Amino acid sequence: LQYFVPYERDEVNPVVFMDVTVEGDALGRVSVELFHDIVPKTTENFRSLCTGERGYSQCPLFYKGIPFHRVIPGFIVQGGDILLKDGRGNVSVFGFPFPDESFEGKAGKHLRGTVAMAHSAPNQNGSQFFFNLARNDHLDGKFVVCGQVIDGWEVVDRVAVLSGSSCGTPVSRAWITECGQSSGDKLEDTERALSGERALHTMPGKEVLDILSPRY
């Protein structure tokens, strides 16, 4: 199994990194390119939720600690749902579920390499995202492609193997250790606002999230 980056890597796009942990084992870092050029709105949501750029709306809008509630081996890896962490809810940074702006193209096709946005009903896009584990032809014309996975695909696939059932309910817990923005525009003045002694969010201790607890 060899992972080839599905598209050609434009440099306008942001790069967002996520650290995934399975049952205490820190697997590594998944870096994500977001398609800004074709997909400006959903990109900004996925970038804001991966930063902590915004405060408590209905919840801390931050992907830190939040588990992967639904994992189907050979199909998808799903995580999000900050509010009600089981997967039962969708929260945007906008204050309401936003519709998919457009399928267009390069956002329409679910390739193996792709991060997409999960919705419970066609025009409500929340915080929930999923990784495509294989080429999905039956999801083209339903769900929005947010972007790629550049590095650390080994991490994702390993999560799919160790943590999942074809029912979708995970065998073992897989949650996000950290998430942030490593590249792209708006990066400097982002980390200025998060700079200081006083942090933005109150979360459990560093090695509580790492080893024994998935921020419930």
Binding site: T177, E197, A199, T202, E207
Partner: protein, 189 residues
């Protein structure tokens, strides 16, 4: 009123030595118009690191970039007081479920244990009991080789071993105090 029980949670009634009574304690709990944001020093701000990780990525050669990682910011063990299930006569390779929980993002459990088992051959301290009194020859062997094992581990190993042995001293004392009739509970009362 002026009651001892004013402004306290019912768990905290027992502490008479610090009554929460008074007018301004009513204002800082119901957080009123001088105190509307109470404690102005509250958790989740640190003046010492400003929430940035001190890690040196600045390394000259790009190969060894992650060489200094898991260098401890404090004792990590003395503060927490995890309960170790280890008598002092065990091998060092059993020491890393415990090192792993502070060192994750750096190494994995299996990785840490292979580095430790490296230390058992390379240095003559196989026993956790040996790792305390040899704390020195551990450390200079460490500094002389400098990179057979990451220098972040060798100060984890030392201050973990010290505490494992110390805790065994405490259990061996607390047990022997029962037959001498001191008799304290699981909560040590």
């Amino acid at each position: 009123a002026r009651s001892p029980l004013a402004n306290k949670s019912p768990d905290e009634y027992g502490n008479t030595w610090d009554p929460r009574t008074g007018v301004e304690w009513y204002h800082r709990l119901r957080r009123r118009g001088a105190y509307r944001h109470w404690p102005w020093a509250r958790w989740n701000d640190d003046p010492v690191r400003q929430h940035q990780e001190l890690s040196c990525r600045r390394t000259f050669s790009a190969a060894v970039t992650g060489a200094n990682e898991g260098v401890p910011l404090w004792n990590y063990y003395a503060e927490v007081g995890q309960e170790y299930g280890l008598p002092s006569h065990f091998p060092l390779s059993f020491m890393a479920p415990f090192i792993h929980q502070y060192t994750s993002r750096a190494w994995s459990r299996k990785e840490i244990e292979r580095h430790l088992k490296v230390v058992e051959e390379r240095t003559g301290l196989r026993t956790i009991q040996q790792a305390c009194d040899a704390t020195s020859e551990l450390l200079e062997w460490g500094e002389e080789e400098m990179g057979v094992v990451p220098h972040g581990l060798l100060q984890h190993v030392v201050m973990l071993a010290e505490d494992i042995v110390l805790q065994n001293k405490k259990k061996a004392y607390r047990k022997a105090a029962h037959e001498r009739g001191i008799l304290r509970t699981t909560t040590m009362e």
